[PDB]
Write a protein that binds this ligand. Sequence first.
Ligand SMILES: NC(=O)CC[C@H](N)C(=O)O
Ligand SMILES: [Mg+2]
Ligand SMILES: [Mn+2]
Ligand SMILES: [Mn+2]
Ligand SMILES: [Mn+2]
Ligand code: NA
Ligand code: NA
Ligand code: NA
Ligand code: NA
Ligand code: NA
Ligand code: NA
Ligand code: NA
Length: 93
Amino acid sequence: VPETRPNHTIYINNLNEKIKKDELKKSLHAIFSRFGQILDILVSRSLKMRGQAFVIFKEVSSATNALRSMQGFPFYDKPMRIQYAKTDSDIIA
RNA sequence: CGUUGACCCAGGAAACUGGGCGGAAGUAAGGUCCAUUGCACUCCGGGCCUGAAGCAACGCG
Ligand SMILES: NC(=O)CC[C@H](N)C(=O)O
Ligand SMILES: [Mg+2]
Ligand SMILES: [Mn+2]
Ligand SMILES: [Mn+2]
Ligand SMILES: [Mn+2]
Ligand code: NA
Ligand code: NA
Ligand code: NA
Ligand code: NA
Ligand code: NA
Ligand code: NA
Ligand code: NA
């Protein structure tokens, strides 16, 4: 059950795990700033959190258009799988 | 690690206190093998190899 309730934050997974934290954080900001003001991008390479990212948008509408537009797009040879986050991010909340 | 400073944040009328901020550390980060498709925000799976830096300057390790 993919989280479909619109939220300020999008959840991305199926990310290439071999990409370095900094390069990844930078590429996602590149890919997503078109859609609106990004407040932050949260990336971790721990066991639980690798292959995933959260990008936080100032406007929900930015999150939606970003989610809708980049869905499934090949990124480092892997299709991005995007949902909304299940719960608000901290700066948003 | 010391001294004398810079700048940011919290508090304070102020003096200043606490942190950001130094030998930090075999840490952060990185390469590879294995494992993992995972909703988090207080870092952080395992093996092998490698491996930094406070913001400035001097001094000392
Ligand atoms: N990391 C350190 O302690 C640096 C000390 C050195 N003497 C310097 O001024 O840079
Ligand atoms: Mg194999
Ligand atoms: Mn004050
Ligand atoms: Mn020592
Ligand atoms: Mn120095
Ligand atoms: Na203050
Ligand atoms: Na007072
Ligand atoms: Na300090
Ligand atoms: Na590493
Ligand atoms: Na690594
Ligand atoms: Na929290
Ligand atoms: Na490892």
